[PDB]
Amino acid sequence: DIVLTQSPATLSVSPGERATISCRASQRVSSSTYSYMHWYQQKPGQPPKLLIKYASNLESGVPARFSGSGSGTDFTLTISSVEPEDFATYYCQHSWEXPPTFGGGTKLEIKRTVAAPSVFIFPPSDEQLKSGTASVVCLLNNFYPREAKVQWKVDNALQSGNSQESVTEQDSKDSTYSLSSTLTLSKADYEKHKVYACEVTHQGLSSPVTKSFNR
């Protein structure tokens, strides 16, 4: 079967710059008249969406900033000016011989401007406390770049465990990340302390930011 090799694996591009991604087929996928290579865009959580068919034909509804070129074995997809919504993995696919196969994808990342997080803290809900567990949530919203440190302090003491973090993909409208950190304690443990705080470090801030509440 035909193998499609995409490059680069990840392309990092500043807002509004041109992006070019490559797909090379292991053997010729064009006739003397047409090329049987197609391009798809897979946004986070979504199926692939067809962008370009037969190397160069823009699918109806697809933005004009997308174009494709090439013939033979070497194909390219170009985004003339990258927009936040273009954050996605892009795949090529041939239909020359059977079976159709796909490339391994190129991830398009966007190097937007530096942004400090906005920080919020949420005590456990009364409904959850009725079940015997306390989840405390710290939200870091809309920051860039990804690197961030979150520490939990309970009555000023650094917590050594019992939290978990998750970070989003780059946002579809502004290219930032957000991060949640959840501290989970038994109700009894929760009720043995007074002050719950999360301390956040990020390069867009010149000192750590602490958000806290008193139980």
Binding site: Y40, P100, S166
Partner: protein, 225 residues
Amino acid sequence: QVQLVQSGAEVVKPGASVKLSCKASGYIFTSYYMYWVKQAPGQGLEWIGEINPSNGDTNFNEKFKSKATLTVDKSASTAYMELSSLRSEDTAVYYCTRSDGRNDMDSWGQGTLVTVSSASTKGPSVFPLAPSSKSTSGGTAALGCLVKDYFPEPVTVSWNSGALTSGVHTFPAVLQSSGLYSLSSVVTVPSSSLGTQTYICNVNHKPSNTKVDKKVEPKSDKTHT
């Protein structure tokens, strides 16, 4: 408008089979080939095979000919894929996709996550993350829903039945020590209008047939006993 709508995610025991469906609307079902495609997260997609809905004829990738069985139901405008004797390598998202002439794949279903596991399905609990005009950043408030203790993936969250999407962040699940998943979905909103706007998170966990709507309100006590 052309739409393909797939069946919900499922947990499947090792060695068992599962039957996935894909309902087509907005076009003549028999006029387009239907493909099925496998994707393990963040991997190149793999073509499983094709059915011609006009006559039931099939073609398979040699790699999947012993794994997949494809059928259609005309009156239901639905294509089916049965996967046999599942093993861990079968855990993946499965898509159906239509093709006019065996070249490009122009319309895709939303995908069905099949998780092969001996563990039982569990639906989540949903808790509010309440906003307050006393807890603002730059005049904005944050609110959300905590979706705790489910298995397998996935959970999806919408807000106000899909009318609220700006500023929403639904985090990737975390795997808890229990072996159950948790996630939160949050939104930032004006702090000025928490008394006039309504924010409801709509949580779906298809493996357990769980749908929960939770109204998230600012919390109302000066008495501490």
